[PDB]
Amino acid sequence: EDPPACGSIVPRREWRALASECRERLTRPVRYVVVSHTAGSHCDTPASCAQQAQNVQSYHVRNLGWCDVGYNFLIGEDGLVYEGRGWNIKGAHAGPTWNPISIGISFMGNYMNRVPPPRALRAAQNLLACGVALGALRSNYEVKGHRDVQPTLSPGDRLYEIIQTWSHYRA
Amino acid sequence: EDPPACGSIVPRREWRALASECRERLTRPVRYVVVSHTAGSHCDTPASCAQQAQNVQSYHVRNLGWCDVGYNFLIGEDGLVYEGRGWNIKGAHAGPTWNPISIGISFMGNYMNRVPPPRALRAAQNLLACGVALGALRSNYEVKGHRDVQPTLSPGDRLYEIIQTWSHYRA
Amino acid sequence: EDPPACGSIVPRREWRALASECRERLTRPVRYVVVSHTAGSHCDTPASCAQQAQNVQSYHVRNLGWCDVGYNFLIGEDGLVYEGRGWNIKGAHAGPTWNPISIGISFMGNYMNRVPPPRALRAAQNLLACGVALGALRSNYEVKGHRDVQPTLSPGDRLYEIIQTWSHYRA
Amino acid sequence: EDPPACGSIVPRREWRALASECRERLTRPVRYVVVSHTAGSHCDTPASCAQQAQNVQSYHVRNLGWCDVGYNFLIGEDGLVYEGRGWNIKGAHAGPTWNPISIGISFMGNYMNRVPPPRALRAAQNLLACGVALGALRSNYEVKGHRDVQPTLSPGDRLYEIIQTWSHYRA
């Protein structure tokens, strides 16, 4: 019955993604969101960012044999959100104790000592709002950094430092 | 926060806009939404699209002497929505009959023999969703094409073809 | 015509409030209002109510060592509103999830078996109308009982039946 | 190692706890213990209580949408201790400051003008004895009353006077 006003995702078909092989479903609503970086190249145009989208989905599939790209959603510095596993499918991104209960969104780039552009941040913040809108995320959603759920520098020092200032970031 | 789930709009601050000096308030709800095309050059990256937004505004302000870019919102092929006069300051896009009752959104470029990428069309359709969500737009909002309201060759044939598709398009 | 034309709040120095020490800021407009009750003694005179206000303030500041009384506004059965930490400061009234996105207004007294006098109710409704008139509260703001966001019998079975009857009540 | 036999707690599972979604952790050895009361109806048979324990959790997770019942343990007039969020997971019972450094045991009942039966008191002090032996509580933990750290009536008046008596109670 209910769409409260969503957000605009670049379909898999658009960034030319290999078909997903995953069947494991995330149980809806989800309470946690885990933010990370791909520690890969950055892209600032819709065109390069679709390339970036497929290179990451390919390390993940052709080299680690996962069923699809690890994250549920990706984020480009071009201000757009590329669709990964989406809101419904479980997705390898932060350890087995955390993959079944959270959504993983990953900024595409390495923000160890670089900050994402205001558009990247608006992209993500608005995505979560759409999530709450469809009811795929619960309004009590808690945003957690990846370093907060496992021994990794992700999502990078300078973007980590930033997500902490968000309304939903929890201890 | 543009209250609700306000679908990622690039702010005036960000595209380096000149201060609006517009004073007329839009009467709320804006039942009609008129689509047009600047009939100017187009842009596919956000960088090129900032500077394209600037161009449409200086022309409107320095040359025509208007209080600000005539459009409430400008859409780029970079798939982003650029803020102009916004949801409240009234626009200069369809003449006096329509200007005080409709919100006007323009696609950057001339769509006479060119189609806008689905990201542009997505960014537009999703911009109206944040419109309703805000109470800026009646949920039962009616989309008109420029031609429909004025003696004009815009949105451009191609873009006009498409908006007939839209569920909210009107006779 | 249209100015503030807000109701009439008894300011801090009028009831000898110790110096606020709070520095955290609510960002307006505010979307939510959480109705609480003090669960203490009630009062029906400007004199006794200004006394009550102070007790409640001290318990919260020396006993618990907080930076000021916890609520943003206190309603008295005398028919007046006692300025709590006001429209602009983040105040401790309903957990770390709501405190930053809501206004806490406590109805001095205990309302499990007791109804507040019309005065009280109007003092509270008035205060809210006023809050919108000032752009402190979002116009479509929502009212949620204290027990609707935290484990507590607050506001009192009887007051709770009352606020549920409001147009902004929405849980 | 030396058995530490204090365990005589009813598992989350003998009273049918819904699965918890909480994942934040207390650091052992925990220094503080906060005694609260549920302010709800009490129970005195292990059957009527397991119900009550489910009733409380239902409120916390289904209305307030919390990841699980907020207290770490619950005592009943039945003389039994109910596993809540247990010894290692951070509860939600006394606010942002206390939650991280304390355990919240809470008596199931309204002890405003009632005393809890001796068996409940025994079960509680025994429960604490447990914590120290397991190494979960510091050998010299400090008991604090719910109202001593937050604006409320808990642990109930007569029960508040009773704990003020204990040897680990502190200012």
**Rounded CA Rg of chain C:** 15
Residue A31 and residue D21: Cβ atoms within 8 Å? yes
CA distance A56 to A83: 12
Question: What is the resolution of the experimental data for this entry, in Å?
Answer: 2.8
CA distance B130 to A130: 10
Amino acid, res. C9: I
What distance in Å separates residue D1's CA from the closest CA in chain C?
Answer: 39
Q: Which of B105, B111, B59 is nearest to B84 (CA)?
A: B105
Strand partners, C142: C32
What distance in Å separates residue C103's CA from the closest CA in chain D?
Answer: 16
Residue C64 and residue D96: Cβ atoms within 8 Å? no
Is the Cβ of B3 closer than 8 Å to some Cβ of chain C?
Answer: yes
Q: Which uninterrupted H or E stretch holds D52?
A: helix D46-58
Q: Which uninterrupted H or E stretch holds B30?
A: strand B30-37
CA angle D35, D41, D47 (to 5 degrees): 95
CA angle A10, A20, A76 (to 5 degrees): 30
Compute CA distances D143 → D35, D75, D81, D111, D155, whole Å. Answer: 7, 15, 17, 18, 12
The separation between CA A162 and the C-alpha centre of its own chain, rounded to angstroms, equals 16
Please classify residue C3 by burial: count the beta carbons closer than 10 Å to its beta carbon, then call 0-12 exposed, 13-18 middle and 19+ buried.
exposed
Compute CA distances D54 → A44, C116, C139, C159, whole Å. Answer: 52, 33, 39, 27
CA distance D21 to C88: 35
Q: How many CB atoms lie within 10 A of CB A95?
A: 14
Range of the structural domain that residue C147 is part of: 1-171
Is the Cβ of A46 closer than 8 Å to some Cβ of chain B?
Answer: yes
Q: Is B152 left (phi over 0), alpha (psi -120 to 50) or beta?
A: beta
Residue A140 and residue C101: Cβ atoms within 8 Å? no
Which residues of chain C are within 8 Å of residue B135 when distances are taken between CB atoms? 140
Task: Tell me the residue length of chain C.
Answer: 171
Is the Cβ of A165 closer than 8 Å to some Cβ of chain C?
Answer: no
CA distance A159 to B10: 20
Q: Which of D28, D63, D24, D42 is nearest to D120 (CA)?
A: D42
Question: Hey, is B95 helix, strand or coil?
Answer: helix
Q: Which of A155, A86, A94 is nearest to A120 (CA)?
A: A155
CA distance A40 to C125: 55
CA distance D165 to D147: 16
DSSP C28-53: SSEEEEEEEE--S----SHHHHHHHH
Compute CA distances B108 → A63, B71, B114, C69, whole Å. Answer: 41, 11, 12, 54
The separation between CA D28 and the C-alpha centre of its own chain, rounded to angstroms, equals 17
CA distance C82 to C76: 7
CA distance A69 to A38: 11
**D93-104 burial string, b = 16+ CB within 10 Å, else e?**
bbbeebbbebbb
Amino acid, res. D35: V
CA distance C144 to C36: 9
| DSSP designation for A109 | S
Cβ pairs C/D, distance under 8 A: 28
What distance in Å separates residue C170's CA from the closest CA in chain B?
Answer: 16
Q: How far apart are the first and last CA of chain C?
A: 34
Contact B131, B72 (CB under 8 A): no
* Nearest-Cα residue of chain B relative to residue C138: B3
Residue B127: partners with Cβ closer than 8 Å, 6 or more residues away: B7, B9, B73, B75, B81, B105
Is the Cβ of A165 closer than 8 Å to some Cβ of chain B?
Answer: no
Contact C101, C30 (CB under 8 A): yes
Is the Cβ of A139 closer than 8 Å to some Cβ of chain C?
Answer: no
DSSP B128-152: HHHHHHHTSEEEEEEEEEHHHHSS-
| DSSP designation for D146 | G
Compute CA distances B80 → A66, B2, B50, B114, B164, whole Å. Answer: 32, 16, 10, 18, 22
**Rounded CA Rg of chain D:** 15
Contact D9, D87 (CB under 8 A): no
The separation between CA B132 and the C-alpha centre of its own chain, rounded to angstroms, equals 15
Q: Which of A124, A132, A138, A123 is nearest to A3 (CA)?
A: A132
**D141-159 burial string, b = 16+ CB within 10 Å, else e?**
bebbbbbbbbbbbbbbbeb
| Residue that has been written with the tokens 């992209």 in this structure | A123
Chains B and D contact (Cβ–Cβ under 8 Å for 3 or more pairs): no
A 63-102 residues with CB below 8 A of B? Answer: 78-80
Determine which of C72, C153, C157 to mutate to test the interface with D (most D C-beta atoms within 10 Å).
C153
Residue A80 and residue B7: Cβ atoms within 8 Å? no
Q: Which uninterrupted H or E stretch holds B160?
A: helix B157-165
CATH number at residue D93: 3.40.80.10
Question: Hey, is D30 helix, strand or coil?
Answer: strand
What distance in Å separates residue D111's CA from the closest CA in chain A?
Answer: 31
Amino acid, res. D99: N
Please classify residue C28 by burial: count the beta carbons closer than 10 Å to its beta carbon, then call 0-12 exposed, 13-18 middle and 19+ buried.
middle
The token duo for A62 is: 């052709």
What distance in Å separates residue B66's CA from the closest CA in chain A?
Answer: 29
In chain D, how many domains are there?
1
Instruction: Write out the E strands in chain A.
Output: 9-10, 30-37, 73-75, 81-83, 102-107, 137-145
Please tell me which chains touch B, using 3 or more CB pairs under 8 Å as the contact test: A, C
CA distance D142 to D145: 10
Residue A143: partners with Cβ closer than 8 Å, 6 or more residues away: A32, A33, A34, A35, A128, A163, A166, A168, A169, A170
Q: Is C86 left (phi over 0), alpha (psi -120 to 50) or beta?
A: left
Contact C97, C34 (CB under 8 A): no
Is the Cβ of B4 closer than 8 Å to some Cβ of chain C?
Answer: no
* Nearest-Cα residue of chain C relative to residue D60: C151
The separation between CA D142 and the C-alpha centre of its own chain, rounded to angstroms, equals 14
Of D70, D149, D151, the CB nearest to C151: D70
Which residues of chain B are within 8 Å of residue A6 when distances are taken between CB atoms? 5, 7, 126, 129
Strand order in the sheet with A137-145: A9-10, A81-83, A73-75, A102-107, A30-37, A137-145
Is the Cβ of C125 closer than 8 Å to some Cβ of chain B?
Answer: no
Of C39, C63, C92, the CB nearest to D153: C39
What distance in Å separates residue A13's CA from the closest CA in chain B?
Answer: 12
Which residues of chain C are within 8 Å of residue B1 when distances are taken between CB atoms? 27
The token duo for C85 is: 């930490």
Compute CA distances A76 → A80, A125, A157, B75, whole Å. Answer: 6, 13, 18, 19
The token duo for B98 is: 């329509």
Contact C48, C108 (CB under 8 A): no
Q: Hey, what's the torsion of the CAs at C147, C151, C153, C158, to 10 degrees?
A: 10
Question: Hey, is B158 helix, strand or coil?
Answer: helix
* Nearest-Cα residue of chain C relative to residue A142: C97
Contact B169, A41 (CB under 8 A): no
Instruction: Write out the E strands in chain D.
Output: 30-37, 73-75, 81-83, 102-107, 137-145
Residue A8 and residue B45: Cβ atoms within 8 Å? no
| DSSP designation for D29 | S
Contact D146, D28 (CB under 8 A): no
What distance in Å separates residue D133's CA from the closest CA in chain C?
Answer: 31
**What pairing do the DSSP bridges indicate for beta strands A137-145 and A30-37?**
parallel
Residue D64 and residue C153: Cβ atoms within 8 Å? no
Compute CA distances C11 → B111, C83, C86, C142, whole Å. Answer: 61, 5, 10, 25
* Nearest-Cα residue of chain D relative to residue C40: D153
Strand partners, C82: C10, C74
